[PDB]
Each structure stands twice: as structure tokens, then as C-alpha cells.
Amino acid sequence: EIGTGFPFDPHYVEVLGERMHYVDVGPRDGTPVLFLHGNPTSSYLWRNIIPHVAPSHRCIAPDLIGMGKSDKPDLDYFFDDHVRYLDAFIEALGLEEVVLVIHDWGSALGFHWAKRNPERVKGIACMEFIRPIPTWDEWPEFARETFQAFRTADVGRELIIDQNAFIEGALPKCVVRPLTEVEMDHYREPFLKPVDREPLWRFPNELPIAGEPANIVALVEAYMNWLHQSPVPKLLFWGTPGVLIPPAEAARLAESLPNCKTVDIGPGLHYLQEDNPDLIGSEIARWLPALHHH
Ligand SMILES: [Cl-]
Incomplete structure (x- = not known):
């Protein structure tokens, strides 16, 4: 079955005046x-x-x-804020060449860094990543209303900050098996105080949906252009039905992305790591050795 513990020693590094x-x-x-x-x-x-x-x-x-x-600095937590902190994080640890394992907004940060540091990426493992969603029709029906509501300064703050609906609602609804309360409490912990949920609200307001916001749509388009012509080894995991990357789009990507291997995870929605962590982990370890040479 799936483990609920977090047996890792913490490590902390000072980056832009803040501890990460x-x-x-x-x-x-x-x-x-x-x-x-x-x-x-x-x-x-x-x-x-x-x-x-x-x-x-x-x-x-x-x-x-x-x-x-x-x-938790008092930030707007725009994508560009995460870009700055993440960039500084990586230099702070003296990373040179890397392999990238990325999901959701981690995938926007990770593709954006790769495009800008192409020589330092030996491979990308991705799953349920962000690319332009050009129309609301191209967002999944079952989540259209929810995300349209999230993308408002009144209703969307209400739901996500005041009622914690991204942690209590969206997260568990995008994992096919039921999260346990031990898992839910590890996800709830950083956001016990409502005022700290600002990033949870700004993030779906940064999604490149229906041409808006214009800056994110362009920056995402630019990293998707780069990816489509980069020979970097790519490993894409997908599930059924999926959310951002449904099966038919995973197949299309297998064909259109250079040096791409896809892996079918079985059931899953958005947080694929919660439904088939073992196949994801094992398939990644499997894949890494052949990236190593020059
Ligand atoms: Cl989001």
C-alpha cells in the first residue's frame, strides 16, 4: 500500500532573506x-x-x-516570485547539471528554468504539467465551474483562503483513491492559519487559461516551444482519466515531443503521485542511468 510518513531530515537554506x-x-x-x-x-x-x-x-x-x-514572506506569490526564489535556491546549493522530476506549478518552474538553462538539463520526468489551455472548453468539464469560481477576487478568495477549499476540496477530488486523514493533516499543516493561503489562491489565478493572464500564457508558450524541439530525454507519466493531460493528449505528446517515453499509471486524476507512487518511482530510477553519458 502507500506510506503516510515523511522520514526525511530537514535541511534549510537562506535564500533572498527567507529560509527554505x-x-x-x-x-x-x-x-x-x-x-x-x-x-x-x-x-x-x-x-x-x-x-x-x-x-x-x-x-x-x-x-x-x-x-x-x-x-512565509508577505508576497503576492505570483509565478515570478517562485521563479526568483527557486532560481536562487538552485544557485545556493551549487547545482550544475540536473535531472528534473516535475508536476503542476513545479512543471511551469522546471520547464521555465530548463529553457533558460538548457545545457544543465540531462532529462525531464513530468506528469500532469502546465501548458496553455486556450479556451475554457479545453479545461476539464468536471472542474470548469470550480476553477472559474477560484479565478475571482471575491468568490475565489472566499473558497480558497477563508474556507480552505483547495486543501479540503480540490486536492482530494483530484486523487482517485481516498486520501487518509494522516495524509490530509500533512497537507493541511503549512496552512493552518488562513492568511498563509495566499499562494493557494494566486496559483489558480496564474493558470494560463483562455489567454489570461497574458504574461503566463506567453512564458508557458515559450517553454512548450523549447520542449517540442529539445532533444532532452523526457519521461511522461499519465493516468486515466487524468486532468490536465488526458490519455489521448498523452499519446499525442509521446509522438510530438522528441525522445519521449510515456508511462501509463492506471487510474488517476491530477496528483498521480498519490495513486501510483511505486511505478513512478521505479520507472524514474530505471530511466536515469542512460542519461549520464556526455
Ligand atoms: Cl493552481
Whole structure:
């Protein structure tokens, strides 16, 4: 079955005046595997995947600014704020070449960094990542209303900040098996005080849906252009029915993305790590050795 503990020693690093928490295990020689969570999650989302990979490779899984066990400065938490902190995080640890394991807003941060540091990416493992959703018709029906409501300064603040609906509502609804209360409490913990939920609200207001916001739609389009023509080894996990990346779109991507291997996870929605962590972890470890050469 799936484990609910988080048996990792904390590591902390001062970045732009703020302390960021991260996981750090595995050997210190060789290429590190850098794990990037999104909304409303943290390193806790990678807990059952990292132990498949750490036997062979350094695993670094940071908590984004405002999230996890990282500090909570009073920010708008625009994507660009996460870009600044994440960039500084990576330089602070002296990372040179990396492999990237990425999801959701972690995938926006990770593709954006790769495009800008192409020579430092030896491979990308991705799942339920962010690319333009050009019309609301191209967002999943079952979540259209919910996300349209989230994308408002009145209703959307109400639901997400005041009633915690992204943690209590969206998260569990996008995992096919039922999250346990132990798991839910590890996800609830950073956001016990409502005022700290600002990143949970700004994030769905940053999604590139229906041309808006214009800056994110362009920056995402630019990293998707880069990806489509990069020969970097890519490993894409997908589920059924999925959310951002439904089966038919995973097949299309298998064909249109260079040097891409896809893996079918079975059932899942958005947080695929919670439904099949073992296959995700094992398939990643499997894949890493052949990335190593020049
Ligand atoms: Cl979001």
C-alpha cells in the first residue's frame, strides 16, 4: 500500500532573506535529481517516490516559498516570485547539471528554468504539467465551474483562503483513491492559519487559461516551444482519466515531443503521485542511468 510518513531530515537554506526547507538524500557525487511540487502540495507529495531513486542518485526536493516547511514572506506569490526564489535556491546549493522530476506549478518552474538553462538539463520526468489551455472548453468539464469560481477576487478568495477549499476540496477530488486523514493533516499543516493561503489562491489565478493572464500564457508558450524541439530525454507519466493531460493528449505528446517515453499509471486524476507512487518511482530510477553519458 502507500506510506503516510515523511522520514526525511530537514535541511534549510537562506535564500533572498527567507529560509527554505528541502529534502536532501543520496550520494553527493553524480547528477542530482531535483523534485518540484506544485499547488497545494509540498515535498510531502514526493515522499513515496524519492526512496525508489535515492539508492542511486542525490534527491533534492524543496518546499516552494510560502509552502511546506519553508518561510512565509508577505508576497503576492505570483509565478515570478517562485521563479526568483527557486532560481536562487538552485544557485545556493551549487547545482550544475540536473535531472528534473516535475508536476503542476513545479512543471511551469522546471520547464521555465530548463529553457533558460538548457545545457544543465540531462532529462525531464513530468506528469500532469502546465501548458496553455486556450479556451475554457479545453479545461476539464468536471472542474470548469470550480476553477472559474477560484479565478475571482471575491468568490475565489472566499473558497480558497477563508474556507480552505483547495486543501479540503480540490486536492482530494483530484486523487482517485481516498486520501487518509494522516495524509490530509500533512497537507493541511503549512496552512493552518488562513492568511498563509495566499499562494493557494494566486496559483489558480496564474493558470494560463483562455489567454489570461497574458504574461503566463506567453512564458508557458515559450517553454512548450523549447520542449517540442529539445532533444532532452523526457519521461511522461499519465493516468486515466487524468486532468490536465488526458490519455489521448498523452499519446499525442509521446509522438510530438522528441525522445519521449510515456508511462501509463492506471487510474488517476491530477496528483498521480498519490495513486501510483511505486511505478513512478521505479520507472524514474530505471530511466536515469542512460542519461549520464556526455
Ligand atoms: Cl493552481
